[PDB]
Amino acid sequence: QLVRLQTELQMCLEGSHPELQVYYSKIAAIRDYKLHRAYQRQKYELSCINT
Amino acid sequence: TIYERLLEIKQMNERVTKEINTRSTVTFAKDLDLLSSQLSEMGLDFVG
Amino acid sequence: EVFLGDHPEPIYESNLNLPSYNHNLTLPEDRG
Amino acid sequence: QGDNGQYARQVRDLEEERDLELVRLRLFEEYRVSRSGIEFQEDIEKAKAEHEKL
C-alpha cells in the first residue's frame, strides 16, 4: 500500500490521477461561465453606445 | 369565512394561471444573470 | 416655405439620408 | 434667395456651432469605448486569476 499510495501521489502531483481530474472539469466550467458573462456585458454596452 | 376566500381565489384562477404560464424573460437580464431563482430552487414557482 | 427651399415638413431620421458609418462596435456572438 | 448679407452671416454661425457639437460627440464616444474596454479587461483578469488561486 505504500507502493500504491506514493505511486499515485507522485503520478498525481503532475495532474493525471482521477480525483484531481474530476475537480478540473468542474472548475473550468465556472471560469468559462464567468468569461461568457463578461463578453455579454461588453456586447450589450457597445451596442448601446452605438445607438 | 373560509369558503368565501377560497371562492375568490378560484375565481382568479384562470387569469392567474394563463398569466404565469405566458411569462417572458428579458434576454439581457438572463445573460447578465440578474434575476433570482430562490422560489425555483424550492419548487415554489407556479409552473404550468 | 415650400417655395423658398426650406422643408416645412417634419424631417425625421429617415429623411436626412445621412451616410452610414462604421466604428468597431457591435461585437459578434460568443466570440469571447 | 439666400445671399442676404445678414442671413448669410448667421447661417455660418449656426453651422460653426453645429460642428463643434459633432466633434464633442465623437470625442465622447471614444471615451465611452475606452471606459467599457477598461472594465472588460479588469473583469477578465480577475476571473482568470482568482479561478487559478481557488
DSSP B1-48: -HHHHHHHHHHHHHHHHHHHTT----HHHHHTT-S--HHHHSS-S---
Judged by phi (left if over 0) then psi (alpha if -120 to 50, else beta), residue B23 lies in: beta
Nearest of D18, A10, B14 to residue C16 by alpha carbon: D18
| CA atoms lying within 13 Å on the CB side of residue B15 | 4
Q: Do A49 and D36 touch (CB under 8 A)?
A: yes
Using DSSP, state whether A30 is helix, strand or coil: helix
Contacts of A among chains (3+ CB pairs under 8 A): B, C, D
Report the length, in residues, of chain D: 54
- In whole angstroms, how far apart are CA D28 and each of A8, D23, D25? 59, 8, 5
Nearest of D38, B44, D14, B13 to residue A38 by alpha carbon: D38
Q: From the CA of D35, how many Å to the nearest CA of chain A?
A: 10
Neighbours of A39 (CB within 10 A): 19
| CA atoms lying within 13 Å on the CB side of residue D46 | 9
Q: What is the resolution of this structure in A?
A: 2.6
| Gap between the Cα atoms of D23 and D34, Å rounded | 17
Q: How many CB pairs under 8 A join A and D?
A: 29
List chain B residues with CB under 8 Å of A44: 28, 31-32
Nearest of D4, D26, D1, B48 to residue C21 by alpha carbon: D26
Which residue is it, cell 461568457? Answer: A36
Judged by phi (left if over 0) then psi (alpha if -120 to 50, else beta), residue D47 lies in: alpha
Structure determined by:
cryo-EM
List chain C residues with CB under 8 Å of A42: 27
Query: CA Rg, chain D, in Å?
Result: 24
| Cell numbers found for residue A31 | 471560469
Chain B residues with at least one Cβ partner in A under 8 Å: 28, 31-33
Q: For residue C20, what are the contacts with CB-CB under 8 A and spacing of at least 6? A: none
